[PDB]
């Protein structure tokens, strides 16, 4: 049968009182370094964010997003302790409703950030929560980024596509590591922190729940 | 990994406003035979229905549903175009927070009327929808009685617990086929109507998505 | 994938002029013996013609029939140059929306007629078209009694029900032969003169075309 | 034995009152993205319609068709919400009665349109159903054009010769899965809305039923 | 594929001037001994001959015959030398359209006679050409009875009905052998005087040419 | 043993009143295209006809026939419709008393039509039959050309020689499936029409069954 | 190598201001069912709390406990939203300094408790956090008993001894499950919502790490 | 399961009087040469001891650290018998935060110093200790500098990071063992004097554990 | 080859000042259960300690002694923390010169003390070093009973014969598991705190190296 972890997850669109996400049961552990990756079929071309990790006392603790330019250029954005968005962009040319595999790498040990666009690297950036050591309790929201613990959604926002095969670790995944999760056919490895699909988490306003034809047709 | 047939929804419970359920994308064609199987974990003891099927004219064409009495003994029934809940006791002592497997087989044709607990048939019974044929387009939601097509749910007919497995077919599986349906190491066949996350559905109001230990642990 | 042989028709219901029925490509060549098998699932208990075999100068050259009592037995008949249909019931309870495998043997050779239920006789008759040889250029239509080749239904004579695997031989196959044809994970033999699906047919006034779950679900 | 995705439908050809035609039971969900792909033996040279999707509100939400000029250049078009007919002409030439495996990609994400002759692509196409979304219940008809929900066909927009292996997914398949999908010896994969043979659909009005010889002789 | 031992011959029925039989092209060597077994479906109840062995100046050397009586009791007969038909009885009814394996044992050493029914023994005779040779030039013909070299038939005695597997030793088999040569699954021998279908024949006045459904369905 | 397929059949040679030749017992379904090869060892130079299809109005609906040159130029050639013989040569000498694989591939939807000899192309003729469609019925005759169904020879048309191995298809095969049609030691593939030895057909005038050494020796 | 599952942590034992413990990183989910074990040495036979889970405002959320009485009588307790203590002695002689299998069921949807000593059932009992639902956020020690977030030990409420192999599952585990999670060749099931050694924990207070002898040696 | 060499530990930081560190149970045995490799995740760039050998009279009887400079560069020191810290710098640049493998070889029969970085050789000093034997009861201590037996820290000393698949020899392992040590998939040896895990050791001031994601994914 | 487990210690005889024994490297840790297997060959019948561990300020922490009686009976004797020597007979008949396998296990968690003989227990006893633990640092001496920190020898209660495959684990080891450590053939398992000859030791007065030949011959 079709692996787990091609199950997809569908974000119609936003719009109040509307706001299609996803909350996971379990909040994050503290962390000082974080992986993030997943494979998304983006709609929009505007700035949308995927991750949002908050605290009691920080709504931006962690939030990854992403832009597509006229040019479709793809631009990975991360944005640690309430600071300013950064951004990387790809050499790869965007089409919107495609799939495509996304990895963020934070390291608030030495404040390094990378990202990757389909098991190859884009670029790296400094300075980025450098010294940040994200507090225990963490709440993760996927799909609309959070202003309250689980709440507090702005339309303009929120991301909206296809998501599937998000896995999350606790470590600085280096390079060669980051292309084996990205393939296919790889050994598909699994977050320690958060394994899609294995970790239970909570659905509302409307999305999807289907089957993504990325990797197996 | 996990195979994709134990994924589980969770249903938290009703309460106006909010009406946690599912309702599949697709609308089913024109039946007069069905049988709908799925693993079970109920919540509570007092009537709720599961399988809710309605068109533009008949919010109530099929409808299955169950109910646990005092000395535990599990009531599943059926409800065909309108009629009144009709129940057949299975001879097996249910405990809430438990799994189940569950079948109801109905023939239009002849208007007979099956339902089983754990592969073994608890009884027939008859006159249930004789002659009726389900009109094309019926909507499926689960986890709440329609009143209108996808919507108008009464917290009182609404089902809490835990379900997963969910197959259906146009046709009424003979009491030797439903055995090999419910069995876990079996060959786990897949309905040709509603294949359990390979149709996809849409959730709403806080279902909770995991994994089911049923089968395998 | 499933097998081509488990594919079926279903003839939803006759009434004037709408006359759901499939007719084949190629007449039959001239034969003095034939056996017709195939999966039914019959919907209503009274008498409906199957098969019709007729030539430009009789209409009722040979013709399957069968029709359920009230206690729930089953009556295959046979029709053989226009004589009067003859029957023989069967020792098994027909259930209206299920499936069985169902024979009959002729050969004009000797006149003689055998009905089979599931692989079992059900018993033999004498002095059916004894002598007769079906003229060359039978026309076949299933589900519609012919009066006119292709042609002239009449819809109380129309048979409703789920059918496949027909599989037709110009000879009088044995009892012990008959047995190995019915069983589902048997070697499932072809027909000389028509084998499913492997002899193209003519489809019209709204026959169903989808899939058999009698022997793989 | 031959493989189910082998068999063939035969559409003689349209002549008032006469639209031999297959319609399919269950409808589409609603979908934003679409990839249709069948095996066809064009028989005539100018416009026909194929794959007709049509909402109680728009009997022209999704249309296939394709014409052969007179250097025998195959041309493909795509007609979505009752735009004009967009085509995009391939590099090879027809022969009309012989086999040829054609996809049309579309996602109304970005509005690209992308068509394929024998698993090499031919070209694409933008602003074709740009931000456009079938809505729900789409019904399907092939060989004719419906102007009213399985009905109101035009023997001018109808097309003729004979088609199989008919697969639909409501995702825009990359270039290089289009390829798996047209080779004969490949994995042959299924479509995850419509799988040929295996989601039921009716015929009227003459359609032969056979086998196709163009993959396995 | 089916194997070339399968192959039958219809012998449709005489009535002058049409006279269907067949006719070896090599001619008998000298014998002494002979062994001539066959599988045949009887058409008709009353006597006709099988194998007419003739020389130019004994249209009688030897021939095969058979008739079947009211209770259904077969009876194989033999011919040598312008004798009288000698028949033996045997102990199985006979289905006028069905298959049976016979053989005639000759031996003119001592001039015994044996003929089987199904590879068992029905019972010997003696004084049966006792003494007797066939002259070398023996010509062959089946279905009918020479009064003159492959001619000179009489419509009375010719043998209607199927025919296939015929093979001949210039041997008297054993009993233990004539049983393995009868069996369908059998180690199939082919006789060393005459191999079904490995030495030519011609064939005239409408024989049917088909396939023997006996040993394989 | 030999296969089925080695079977052979011989025509000895006309000369009224004797007309050797094979007429088959079903009649051909009503076809617009077609493909019929067949492996042929010639005995004279002069034009006959091999394949003749004729309806109860058309007795020249389909034919093919051959004929030699002086230089030895082998020259195949084909009638549909009444129309007149079209031939094309091939690049290949015969040799009178050898075999030669031969196919004959016909296409009324847009009327070319092209011969083979030995698994390599001829060459292709244009407008031969176009737009016709052999009506249902067809009867079909080797060895002589009818006049009248089954009927109405001329010795001066008839074809002498040895042939086996007859199969034929409702499809127009491509060329590269022509090819592994003629190969001895290919998957050597059957007829969905016909195919030889499998397809009963009626022998008179002294035609000779044996087998065939091209293949097999 | 020695299996992952076979680390095992001592607790020496506790005396103010020293209180050896673990405190899980991440805090468990809102749960409503759970289920406990682990493979335990103990140390003392008066009682002590192993399991000790708390929320911001319940530090008696859950908490599991043992003591052996003079007969040697293993005694497995539980308490759930600050109830009372419930135990349910098990039918085996206990040997401080031993290794033995534990497990406590717990499931809020009905209130029953079952506890397991070595694969099988002790008892069960009723009414025990009926209806309770420990809320998101639940903080785990081991080996000490909280009475403020991570905190507040009392020594006389600690518990020594080895332990390892601690499984959690937020699901009522059947008592065949259960059986299979204690042996030691069995399959070794891992817990969903904490793995041993697969989910980090801080240590304090002299624990010791080592390796569990119970199952291999 | 994760090998149990994976484990990891994690030493958050220090600062009075939290010394986060760990202290294994036995003590070691007199010793003259030693090998001390392990993998590490470091934190801070600033000088860090990892290893602490100290007797009961000589705190600084064996004690590895490191720091890293300004440009990058890994600086591997080890310091005998109260003699003052030697330095190798390594050809690799450090990236806090990130997985190495480390080794210290000394032998003290002749003074000699190697340190390793990944397998591969630094460099190698001279007059490290010469003639100098480590007196028996060495006890050890990990992430802080003792100054007293298993005390006397000082948080300026400490080292902060991860660690795991620590190995001791007595022995002065040559380069091409170093190597072998190193590689993650290699045979994986064990030192014979400490074990990762085998041997046990005691846990104090919030070291965390988990797994290392170093080797594995 | 032979197995490293194989190599025997003999202890040819004490008598001032020459006193043959052996002294582990390493010191034992902090424990509180013991079990201490060997295989001994004595060589006399009076009473002789064989392992003895001493601290700096307890020399008599853990004896374990034998002694044999008049009619051949095995004494096993253990003493703890300056206790006296408890014994235990057991149901053998020694013969000196002979090879025997032996374990002690103790537990001062409840004060328990078992021997065996051979795999097989001979008793256990209760009140010895009740709640003691061997504080760390312990000497280890074999054959010959310390007063002093490896040393202090008395010629009186030194033990002589031969001593291999001793084994040591800081767990109290259950019947069934010391049963699998006794067998020659068995998995041979080793000692997590001594593994005979893994653990380096010292020798002095002129004890012999050799091979055991109780095991393997
Ligand atoms: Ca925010
Ligand atoms: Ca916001
Ligand atoms: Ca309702
Ligand atoms: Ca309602
Ligand atoms: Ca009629
Ligand atoms: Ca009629
Ligand atoms: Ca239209
Ligand atoms: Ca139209
Ligand atoms: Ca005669
Ligand atoms: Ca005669
Ligand atoms: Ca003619
Ligand atoms: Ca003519
Ligand atoms: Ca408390
Ligand atoms: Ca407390
Ligand atoms: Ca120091
Ligand atoms: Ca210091
Ligand atoms: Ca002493
Ligand atoms: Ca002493």
Not at 41 to 51: E, V
Not at 60 to 68: A, D, G, H, K, L
Not at 164 to 188: M, P
Request: aromatic content about 8%; some cysteine.
């Amino acid at each position: 049968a079709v692996d787990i972890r091609d199950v997809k997850i569908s974000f119609p669109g936003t719009q109040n009182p509307k706001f299609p996400h996803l909350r996971f049961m379990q909040t994050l552990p503290a962390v000082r370094q974080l992986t993030v990756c997943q494979r998304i079929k983006p709609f929009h071309r505007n700035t949308g964010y995927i991750f949002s990790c908050a605290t009691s006392n920080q709504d931006n603790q962690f939030i990854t997003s992403m832009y597509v330019k006229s040019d479709g250029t793809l631009n990975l954005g991360l944005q640690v302790n309430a600071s300013s968005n950064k951004y990387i962009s790809c050499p790869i040319e965007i089409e919107l409703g495609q799939w495509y595999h996304v990895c963020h790498v934070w390291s608030g040990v030495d404040g390094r950030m990378a990202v990757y666009a389909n098991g190859s690297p884009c670029g790296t950036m400094e300075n980025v929560g450098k010294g940040h050591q994200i507090s225990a309790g963490g709440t993760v929201v996927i799909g609309q980024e959070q202003d309250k613990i689980g709440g507090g959604f702005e339309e303009q926002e929120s991301w909206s596509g296809e998501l599937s095969d998000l896995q999350v670790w606790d470590e600085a995944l280096t390079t060669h590591q980051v292309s084996t999760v990205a393939s296919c056919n790889g050994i598909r490895p699994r977050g320690n922190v958060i394994s899609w699909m294995e970790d239970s988490f909570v659905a509302d306003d409307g999305v999807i729940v289907g089957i993504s034809h990325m990797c197996s047709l």
